[PDB]
Design a protein around this ligand. Structure first.
Ligand code: CA
Ligand code: CA
Length: 279
């Protein structure tokens, strides 16, 4: 399958070189897999989700996405026009309020919830969790992410937007999950992107067009945008049977475009997510 005039991020992860505009992918499109989006919620009624999204848990007064952040991330995972895995199932967990903030105790509870909730969902091809959030270092938050990964879920987390070493941020600093840096359309490290030895992979993160609340769309930037590219790619690869939840991050690194990025500090991997699609 090919999507013409795709968002540049979708074209980039299906190509070995920058500057293309077609998203090449296999028609299975991640059907049979499930992605939990742990964020501000998901506007499940958006036409771009085609009824494949639902809220399962909120820790606030409503389950509505009053911010837009979680709806944007979920759209990059698996909306029809802006998503990597266009046929996956999307589950929303609202651990952030409508200002984009949340206490660490709530974020930890949200991760423990996903580890248990997956056992009563029909996800035959595997389960993924996308966490476009973070803060200062906390061993309790890192531990919750490790538990979720250990329970059999592919955990993808943002490296953070501080232009610093991600070792001082959580859950980005947890080694056992998949920490995602951001790049721009000219194969440069995004100027805001964190770096360091804890990073596993880079994904497109600057000027990412995706769904927004009110049934609309908009373009924003962040490692929050790179993470759902990798979470979506994981579910796409799990549906194809190429990898498992326990080894998805390593498989993606092994099969990534190597050495294409510039402004990568010494000690940080130069690896860009890539789907290796061949018609
Ligand atoms: Ca290349
Ligand atoms: Ca890792």
């Amino acid at each position: 399958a090919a999507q013409t005039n795709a968002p540049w991020g979708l074209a980039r992860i299906s190509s070995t070189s920058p500057g293309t505009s077609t998203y090449y992918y296999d028609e299975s499109a991640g059907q049979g897999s499930c992605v939990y989006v742990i964020d501000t919620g998901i506007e499940a009624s958006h036409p771009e989700f085609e009824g494949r999204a639902q809220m399962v848990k909120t820790y606030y007064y409503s389950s509505r996405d009053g911010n837009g952040h979680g709806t944007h991330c979920a759209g990059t995972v698996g909306s029809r026009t802006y998503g990597v895995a266009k046929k996956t199932q999307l589950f929303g967990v609202k651990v952030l309020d409508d200002n984009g903030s949340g206490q660490y105790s709530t974020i930890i509870a949200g991760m423990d919830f996903v580890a248990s909730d997956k056992n009563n969902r029909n996800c035959p091809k595997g389960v993924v969790a996308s966490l476009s959030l973070g803060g200062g270092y906390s061993s309790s938050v890192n531990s919750a992410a490790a538990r979720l990964q250990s329970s059999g879920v592919m955990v993808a987390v943002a490296a953070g937007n501080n232009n610093a070493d991600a070792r001082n941020y959580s859950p980005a600093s947890e080694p056992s999950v998949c920490t995602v840096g951001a790049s721009d359309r000219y194969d440069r490290r995004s100027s805001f992107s964190n770096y360091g030895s804890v990073l596993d992979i880079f994904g497109p993160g600057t000027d990412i067009l995706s769904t927004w609340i009110g049934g609309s769309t908009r373009s924003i930037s962040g490692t929050s945008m790179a993470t759902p590219h990798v979470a979506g790619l994981a579910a796409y690869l799990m549906t194809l049977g190429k990898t498992t939840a326990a080894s998805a991050c390593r498989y993606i690194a092994d099969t990534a475009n190597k050495g294409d990025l510039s402004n990568i500090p010494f000690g940080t991997v130069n690896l860009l997510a890539y789907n290796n699609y061949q018609a």
